[PDB]
Structure 1
C-alpha cells in the first residue's frame, strides 16, 4: 500500500518511481500526460480484455460437454459444431501484408533467433552480443566434436580435439563458399589483389568459385588480419593471426572462424521469467531499458558491442551491426498483476502494463546512445493469443499506446505467436488482423501442445508426451503455418519461424536435426544460447530458404480435417512400466522446474528428465507435463495415489540434484514448492486453457510472504 494515486489507479511506489526517474527522462514525454494516459487506456480497454477471457471459458465449456457424448472420429459433426459456436470462423479472401518500416534482419535475413530471460542481466547481455560468435569455440566446448580416444576434453588445450575443430571448419568453408579449384584445408594464406580474394594453395592460387561472396577484409590487403565472406545473406569471417596458439599450428595461420549467429534476439518477459509483483517487473524493465539506452553492464565489466568496421573489396570503409536486433515478448492477455490496483482493489491486466511500459522503454532504442532499430519500428512478440478477434484487440492496444507515447501509428509492430488451437485453425484471419503490423508468425509447438491436450481434455486418454512430436495434428500445424504465411507475402516482408530446441547439451543432435526447419521454409528458428545460435547458423548456409519458400508458393498442404485430428490413444497401448515411466518423467520435470520458480524465482531451468537429458524448462513445457498427467488422471489410466507416490518418489531425487537451496522432502505438506506442483496436476484440467501462471504466481506470491515474517 506504498502506492501512488493517479486517477483510478494506485500504482505501486517502486514502479511509479522507476517510470518517472529512469524510463521517462530522455523521451520528451510529459509524465503527467503519460500517467493520465495509463489511467485512460486501462479504463477503456480492460472491459474487452476481460470479455475476451470469458469467451475462452464459454467456448471451452461447450467443447467439454460436446465431448461427453460415441463414435470415434466424425470430423463432420465436429466441424459444423465448431463453426456453430464460433470456434471455426470463415477463411477470408487472399491478401498481402502491408507492414513497412521494418529492418533487414526481419524482412530479408534468414538466420537463428535467440530468446533470453530479460530478468537475467548477463544472459540478455550475451544474447545481445550473440550476433557474432566463434565457431571454433562452439565446436570445441560442445559434443559436436565427440570425445573419442584422443579428442577428450580437459583442463588444458587438446591439440587432437583442436585439430578436429579446424578440420570441421575447413569443410564448412568448402561447403558454403567454395574455391574454383582445391580445398580450404590446404590453403597456405590469403591476399587481396586487384579487388578480389586470392587464396594460395600448394599447387597454385585459386579464387572464389563466385567472387561475389568476397565481402571484405581487415588489415592490409596484401596480408589481412581477416577475410570477410557472405553466403545466403549470412556473413563469415576468417581470423588470420599466426601469432596465436591456434594460428601457430594452422596451415594458413588461422586463429578462428567467426559466424553471424543470432541475427535477432527476443527479450522475454513471459514464460522464461518469474515476475509476480511490482518489484519483479522493475528489474526486467530496468534491464530492458539499459539494453535500449546501451549502458547495460554486468559487474571485468561486460558491455554491449559497437558495430564492426571493415574494408570493402575496392578499398572503401563500411560497417556492419555488432548487436542483435532486439524484440521483446510481452505477457499474454490472461494474468493481472498488483503492480497497479484501482480504488476498488482489483489488479490491472499485466499485458496492458507491458505494452505501455516496454513500449515507453523501447523509445530509447530509437535514438542515440553513448541504438536498435534504424528504420523506426518497435518489435514486440505477443504470445498466447486465441483467434483473430484477440489479435485485433492486441492491435487496438498498441494503437492506443502509440497515441499516449506520441509515436506515429503502427510504430509498435507485432510478432504473432502461433501456439494455441483457436489461432492455428484461424491463422489467415489472425495475420489479417495485424496485416499492417505483423512481423512474424512462429509455431510455439510446446504451448500449442498443452492447448491441444486441454481443448480435448474431455475427449479421452491422450498419447504419451514423447509421441506428440509425430502426431498428425502437429505436422499439419507446421506446414499450415508456413503456407498461410507465404500466401500473405511474408516472403521478403516478414519472418516465418519455427520453435525451440531444449536439449541444451545435445548439439550434435541439434546439428543433425534442426536443419529440417530451414528445409521446411522457415526463415528463422529459436535457439536458447549464443552458442546454439552459432551452431544453428550452419543450417542456413546449407539451405537456400528463399529458394525453399518460393518452391512452396501456392501450395496448400494441410486440411481443416488434419489440424483437428485429436491425438487420442488407442485402448491399452501401454504396459504398466510404460505408464509408470511417463508418470515419473512428467512428475520429475514439473517438480524440478517449479521448485526453482517458487523457492528462488527462476522461470527457466535445466532439469534432467528420467533418461538423464538436460532439458530447458519454461512454463510452456510445464503446461505440457501438468496437462498430460491431469489428462491421464481424468480418464483413469492412473490413480490419485499414483501421482503422490510418484511426486514423493521424484522429490528427493530433485533435492539431491540441487547451492543456496532448500529441500522439499520429507515433510512435503510444508513445502510451498511441492504443494504448487501438486496443484498444477490435480487442479490442472480446471486452469483456463491449462495455463500455469494462476498457480505459479499465487504460490510465488505465497512463498515471498513467508520469507519476510
Structure 2
C-alpha cells in the first residue's frame, strides 16, 4: 500500500522515513546496507524464533495432558519432576561459573539503588525519569504520606510549618543514620564549612567532623560558606542545600533549604508492557522518543546536564545528572505490521526492536548536540532488557539475535548487553542455564509478581483451582522463586558485576507503606528494585542507605535457599477453601482489574497509569495485571469454581464502577450500559473467556487486535 520494498520485506513508509531521516544520520551506517541487514537478519532468524514459540506449545500440551490423565490425591513431586525432565522442560544444571560480561557502567556493576520503569511512548514521563537521578527529599516527604497527615500536619493549600518541621526532623535523623557526626547530631547543626579539605559542622557549643571523614564528597560555592555540601554513603550521594533566604531555609537552624538524594540510578525506557503500540505509527512514536533521549534533545521540558562540584581537596569535578538508561524490548511472541513480507506476514516485533532500538542507542554513545556533551553509556555498552523468555534456548537466541544486529550496525560484538527477566516458570527452574547462555552479555536478572504468577497459573491450568490473587503473593513457589533468583545471580558472580533486581511497588499513593515494607528487597540481597515514580525513587533510596546490599550479598554467597521442589509447588487451593462471598469478591476483584486497565488501553492507547482498584487504591500496574487476572478467572471457570453467568454478572457491575473511576477524564467514553458496543468491554470479556486458550496466557494477541479494531472504528 504505502510500504517500501527491501528484498522480501515491505516496510511501512512511516518507519522507513523515520529511520532514514532521523535514526541513521550521525551513525555513519550506510542506509542501504542497514536495510539489507534488516532483511537478512529477519530472513535468517525468523524460523528459529517461530520454532521456539512452537516449543512452548509442545511443552504446554504435554503438561496439560499429564494433569488430565491424573486423578490423583495431591501431586507426586518425584513423578512430576521426572516427567518434566523427560520432556525437556527441566534441563540439567550446568557446572558453576562466573559471568564474563565487561564494558559495563558503574551504575550497574557497582551502585545499588532504585530503578525506574517508564512508558517510552510518554515523552513527559520519560524525561522525568531520566531527570530523576536526583530528587528532593523534602518534597518527597512533605508531598506524600510518609509524614502522616495527622491533626495539625495536614497538607494545606499553602505551606504548613508543623508539617515542614516534621519533614526537616525526618531528614536530620536520616543524615545521622547515614553519615554520622563524630559527636552530636545534625539536628543541632548550626552551620557547615570546608576547612583543610575536611567537612566541619558547627554545633551550638562545639564543632565536629564526620565519624568517617571520607563520606565527604564535595561542595558548591566557597569552602568558607558553601551553598551546598555533598556526602556519600553506600555508593549513593546526598547533598545538603544551604540557603537561609529560602522559604524553608529561614526556618532551619542551619539555613538548610533541602536535602537532595541520588535516587533513580538507572531507568528502563519501556517498549513492552507499560505502553500500547499496535502498529508502525505507534512504534515510530516510541522509537522517536528513544532517539530524543539518546541524542539528548528530547523536549516535551528538557534533559538535565551533569552536576558541578568542588572536590574536598580543592579540585573540580562532575556527577551524572541523568539516570543511565536501559531500553526494554518486547519479547519473542508478537509480530507487528510495521514490516510485512511479500506474503503479507507480519514480522516478529522482538527482532525489529533489537534492530531499531539498537540502531538508535548508538547516538547515546556519542556527543549530544551533536556538539556535546551528555551521553548514556560511557563504557560503550547498549543495555537491553528482554522480557517473557522461556528457558536457556530462548536466551541463546536473543544473544545470537544481538550478535547479528551488532554486525549489521558495525558495533563490536557484545556491545548489546542483555537484562534477563525471570518472569516465566521455564526460565525460573532453569535460571542458572539461562544466565550461562548469556554469560558474556548479561547485566541484570530480576523477579516480579504479575507475569510470573500468570505463567504459574497458565502452566498448571489443568491441575485444579488456584488460590486467590492476593494469596499468590505469599505462596511457597513465589517465595522460593524470589530467593532462588538471588542465589543464581550471586553464584554466577553478579556481585560487583551485574544487577540483581526485584519487583515494582504498584501503590503510588502508599509511600509510608512502601518506605516501611520495600526495605525487604535490599535486605534480600537485591542491588536494585522497581519504583513507580521519581518521588518513589527518592523514598526507596533511603532503603539503600539503611541497608548495606554489598555486605548482604557477600553474606548470601554459597547459600542454596530454595529447592527445585519448592519452585515446583503448584499454588493449588485446598479442598474447597472459600465461602461464596469470598468467591464473588475475588471475581469482582479480577474483573475490575481487567476493565480498569483494558478500557484505557483499547480506547486511549495508555499502557500505564494510576488505575484505581476495587477499593480505590491507586495502582500503577502494567499489562501483566491482565495476564494474572484473566488467567485466574479462566482457571476458576475451568474448574467449576464459578459460572459464565458469574463472570458476565461481575463484568457488568464492575464496568460502570470503572466508568465513574474515570470520571474527570474528558476523552473517556463509558462502557455501561451498552456493553456489547464497547470494544474495551468486549476485550475484557474475551481475555477471560478465551484465556485458557491464549499461548502461555499471553494477552497481547487479543489486546492488540481489539486496539486495532478500535483505531479503525475511530477512523470513520
Query: Does the Cα contact within 8 Å between 2:630 and 2:687 map onto a contact in 1?
Result: yes
Whether 1:258 aligns to 2:265 is: no
- In the TM superposition, residue 514 of structure 1 has moved relative to its aligned partner by 0.6
CA distance in 2, matches of 1:28, 1:689: 41
- In the TM superposition, residue 605 of structure 1 has moved relative to its aligned partner by 2.6
After TM superposition, the score normalised by the length of structure 1 is 0.99
Q: In the alignment, which residue of structure 1 is the partner of 2:454?
A: 450
CA distance in 2, matches of 1:312, 1:28: 38
Query: Does the Cα contact within 8 Å between 2:294 and 2:363 map onto a contact in 1?
Result: yes
Whether 1:409 aligns to 2:413 is: yes
- Give the SS at the match of 2:283: helix
- Give the SS at the match of 1:669: helix
- Give the SS at the match of 1:326: strand
Query: Does the Cα contact within 8 Å between 2:522 and 2:528 map onto a contact in 1?
Result: yes
Whether 1:527 aligns to 2:531 is: yes
CA distance in 1, matches of 2:128, 2:618: 21
- In the TM superposition, residue 71 of structure 1 has moved relative to its aligned partner by 2.5
CA distance in 2, matches of 1:605, 1:108: 31
CA distance in 2, matches of 1:618, 1:571: 33
- Give the SS at the match of 1:246: coil
Q: In the alignment, which residue of structure 2 is the partner of 1:593?
A: 597
1:162-201 CA distance string (max 9 Å, x none): 1110011010000100011111011000001111011011
- In the TM superposition, residue 305 of structure 1 has moved relative to its aligned partner by 0.9
CA distance in 1, matches of 2:492, 2:674: 57
CA distance in 2, matches of 1:685, 1:297: 43
CA distance in 1, matches of 2:97, 2:671: 55
- In the TM superposition, residue 617 of structure 1 has moved relative to its aligned partner by 2.4
CA distance in 2, matches of 1:71, 1:56: 28
- Give the SS at the match of 1:470: coil
- In the TM superposition, residue 656 of structure 1 has moved relative to its aligned partner by 1.2
Q: In the alignment, which residue of structure 2 is the partner of 1:582?
A: 586
CA distance in 2, matches of 1:373, 1:355: 17
CA distance in 1, matches of 2:78, 2:211: 57
CA distance in 1, matches of 2:621, 2:253: 43
- Give the SS at the match of 1:589: helix
Q: In the alignment, which residue of structure 1 is the partner of 2:372?
A: none
Q: In the alignment, which residue of structure 1 is the partner of 2:53?
A: 53
Query: Does the Cα contact within 8 Å between 2:631 and 2:688 map onto a contact in 1?
Result: yes
Structure 1 residues 12-91: aligned runs within 5 Å: 12-67=12-67, 68-91=70-93
1:285-311 CA distance string (max 9 Å, x none): 000000000000116xxx101111101
1:46-72 CA distance string (max 9 Å, x none): 000000000101100010010155120
- Give the SS at the match of 1:328: strand
- In the TM superposition, residue 562 of structure 1 has moved relative to its aligned partner by 0.5
Structure 2 residues without counterparts, runs of 5 or longer: 370-374
CA distance in 2, matches of 1:13, 1:516: 49
Which residue of 600, 603, 606 corresponds with 2:607?
A: 603
CA distance in 1, matches of 2:71, 2:291: 53
- Give the SS at the match of 1:26: coil
1:194-213 CA distance string (max 9 Å, x none): 11011011120011011010
Query: Does the Cα contact within 8 Å between 2:612 and 2:661 map onto a contact in 1?
Result: no
The CA RMSD over aligned residues, in Å, is 0.7
CA 1:396/1:69 → structure 2, altered by over 3 Å: closer, same or farther?
Answer: farther
- Give the SS at the match of 1:126: helix
Q: In the alignment, which residue of structure 2 is the partner of 1:549?
A: 553
CA distance in 1, matches of 2:332, 2:460: 22
Which residue of 130, 139, 147 corresponds with 1:145?
A: 147
CA distance in 2, matches of 1:571, 1:602: 40
- In the TM superposition, residue 680 of structure 1 has moved relative to its aligned partner by 0.5
CA distance in 2, matches of 1:163, 1:661: 41
- In the TM superposition, residue 444 of structure 1 has moved relative to its aligned partner by 2.4
- Give the SS at the match of 1:245: coil
Which residue of 692, 699, 706 corresponds with 2:706?
A: 699
CA distance in 2, matches of 1:629, 1:564: 22
CA 1:129/1:354 → structure 2, altered by over 3 Å: closer, same or farther?
Answer: same
CA distance in 1, matches of 2:599, 2:625: 15
Whether 1:686 aligns to 2:693 is: yes
CA distance in 2, matches of 1:645, 1:609: 18
CA distance in 1, matches of 2:592, 2:690: 18
1:251-280 CA distance string (max 9 Å, x none): 000000000000000000000000000000
- In the TM superposition, residue 577 of structure 1 has moved relative to its aligned partner by 1.0
CA distance in 2, matches of 1:605, 1:173: 34
- In the TM superposition, residue 113 of structure 1 has moved relative to its aligned partner by 0.5
1:350-389 CA distance string (max 9 Å, x none): 0000000000000000010121000000000000000000
CA distance in 2, matches of 1:605, 1:111: 23
Query: Does the Cα contact within 8 Å between 2:294 and 2:364 map onto a contact in 1?
Result: yes
Query: Does the Cα contact within 8 Å between 2:365 and 2:377 map onto a contact in 1?
Result: yes
Aligned length: 706
